[PDB]
Design a protein around this ligand. Structure first.
Ligand SMILES: [Ca+2]
Ligand SMILES: [Ca+2]
Ligand SMILES: [Ca+2]
Ligand SMILES: [Ca+2]
Ligand SMILES: [Fe+3]
Ligand SMILES: [Zn+2]
Lengths: 377, 165
């Protein structure tokens, strides 16, 4: 009634209840759920908690290294970009009839991380054996503490929910083995990983350590000059993440042959064309490594595309896509008051003092974000 | 030439001092400051909050500011004034119709005065919306003063709203 820009949609003040979110068999009501969320609606806290925990109990029962059949659509970083996530399922297909694999990094940097998680866990519960989620570097306490996710959780829900999320993250598998050809992982390789059994042997159920194999899988990048490196050296220390390694073309090639794999699919690195295909293996004539990245116009400034991988009938097709409009948030989810008030204080004070003295670009954006790719203290 | 009633934190001196400053500003010597006279100040025109203050000061709502309203208006910022008094003032920046609640459209317009073109109107509208949703503890769709203070009490911006007279 008083409202100024009446065109703009007003967010549901309603919070979805258990009966609106689960049907009688216990199945999630995703269509209802997707819609509420897109209108920036919230759930009752208890219903949110149910989703996170029911999803976590599924993950808890999955192996470190999933065995995944093709056809499959594989996806990179999401980073809270919920409205692009919507576009993504449009492009990659309905989870109802599509097998999906997500390579982690669902939260942080995007102001809709909690929505992504919610929707994702919802889908996992519904499609326990056809939708698969892995762990990115951001799925942990350390980074969420440091970035906005912890904060996002408190504003929209509670800390009690953030914690439930932290426990759910510890359950996230580390790697997939796709169609018996592809090792799929968030970051990359580790000096401490020679075989796939090496992966199976880890205790994943914890906050990722600052050193070691579980750290490396989540954190590794390839060399900046990957494929054209001057030495046949495998791992060097990752001077860009602050931890873990750069791995070299020989490193990947040694590991691929030793384990009879075709390639490695990974996310973890922003890409302008939403994907990057690396040097073909000399043996197979197939790219030894592929980066995939699913946050278009990342951080609203890269103006990059995002992509997904759709493997089917022996063809690895890359579908790209652009960003989709989304609601504005003040940084760190500030309200207009906390934001404007001190400006007010200054400005009126300024006024009165006065009155009383009457008498005597991708690569550009890539460069600006290097500290944030790196590890928090 | 009758005497003048008012309520404020000042003594005879500070009031007398303020009176000299008031006379200096009253060019037409009408006895009540117009907005034109205020805006005669060089520093003042660079300031989006000026007419708010003036509108807040103008207790009787006649469009000028007589000396009583001038004093009581300043008294808000007196070092002797308390937390609530200063906050109540702030509130009234946003409460344009002075009805005692901050409505949606109101909060928008006032913010718009301060950010101008640094924001698309749709963006502004959204943060404006979500702010209320999260602060309207009573479900009415606007903001009481009680709820206002709920958000900002911890900010101690009131400590910054002080002038030496
Ligand atoms: Ca006058
Ligand atoms: Ca007046
Ligand atoms: Ca009002
Ligand atoms: Ca209210
Ligand atoms: Fe990332
Ligand atoms: Zn990452």
């Amino acid at each position: 009634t008083d409202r100024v820009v009446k065109a703009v949609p007003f967010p549901p003040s309603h919070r979805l209840t258990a009966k609106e979110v689960f049907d009688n068999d216990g199945k999630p009501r995703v269509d209802i759920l997707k819609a509420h969320l897109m209108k920036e609606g919230r759930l009752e806290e208890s219903v949110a908690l149910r989703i996170i925990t029911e999803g976590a109990s599924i993950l808890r029962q999955e192996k470190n290294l999933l065995d995944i059949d093709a056809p499959v659509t594989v996806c990179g970083d999401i980073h809270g970009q919920f409205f692009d996530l919507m576009k993504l399922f449009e492009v990659g297909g309905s989870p109802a009839n599509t097998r999906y694999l997500f390579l982690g990094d669902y939260v942080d940097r995007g102001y809709f991380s909690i929505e992504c998680v919610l929707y994702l866990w919802a889908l996992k519960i519904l499609y326990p054996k056809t939708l698969f989620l892995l762990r990115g570097n951001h799925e942990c306490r350390h980074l969420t503490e440091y970035f906005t996710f912890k904060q996002e959780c408190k504003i929209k829900y509670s800390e009690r929910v953030y914690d439930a999320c932290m426990d759910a993250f510890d359950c996230l598998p580390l790697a997939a083995l796709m169609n018996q050809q592809f090792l799929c992982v968030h970051g990359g390789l580790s000096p401490e990983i020679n075989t796939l059994d090496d992966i199976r042997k880890l205790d994943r159920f914890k906050e990722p350590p600052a050193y070691g194999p579980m750290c490396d899988i989540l954190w590794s990048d390839p060399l900046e000059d990957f494929g054209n490196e001057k030495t046949q050296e495998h791992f060097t220390h990752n001077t860009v993440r602050g931890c873990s390694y750069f791995y070299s073309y020989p490193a990947v090639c040694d590991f691929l042959q030793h384990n009879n794999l075709l390639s490695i699919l990974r996310a973890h690195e922003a890409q302008d064309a939403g994907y990057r295909m690396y040097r073909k293996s000399q043996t197979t004539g197939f790219p030894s490594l592929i980066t995939i990245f699913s946050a278009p116009n990342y951080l609203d400034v890269y103006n990059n595309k995002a992509a997904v991988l759709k493997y089917e009938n022996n063809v690895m097709n890359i579908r790209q896509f652009n960003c989709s409009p989304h609601p504005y948030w003040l940084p760190n989810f500030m309200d207009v008051f906390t934001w404007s008030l001190p400006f007010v204080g200054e400005k009126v004070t300024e006024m009165l003092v006065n009155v009383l003295n009457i008498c005597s670009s991708f690569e550009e954006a890539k460069g600006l974000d290097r500290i944030n790719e790196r590890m928090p203290p | 030439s009758y005497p003048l009633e008012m309520c404020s934190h000042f003594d005879a001196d500070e009031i007398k001092r303020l009176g000299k400053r008031f006379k200096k500003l009253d060019l037409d010597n009408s006895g009540s400051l117009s907005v034109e006279e205020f805006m005669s100040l060089p520093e003042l025109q660079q300031n989006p909050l000026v007419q708010r203050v003036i509108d807040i000061f103008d207790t009787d709502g006649n469009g000028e500011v007589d000396f009583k309203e001038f004093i009581e208006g300043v008294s808000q910022f007196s070092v002797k004034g308390d937390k609530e008094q200063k906050l109540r003032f702030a509130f009234r920046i946003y409460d344009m119709d002075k009805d005692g609640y901050i409505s949606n459209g109101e909060l928008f317009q006032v913010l718009k005065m301060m950010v101008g073109n640094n924001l698309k109107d749709t963006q502004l509208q959204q943060i404006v919306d979500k702010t209320i949703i999260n602060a309207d503890k009573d479900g009415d769709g606007r903001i009481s003063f009680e709820e206002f203070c709920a958000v900002v009490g911890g900010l101690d911006i009131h400590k910054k709203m002080v002038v030496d007279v």
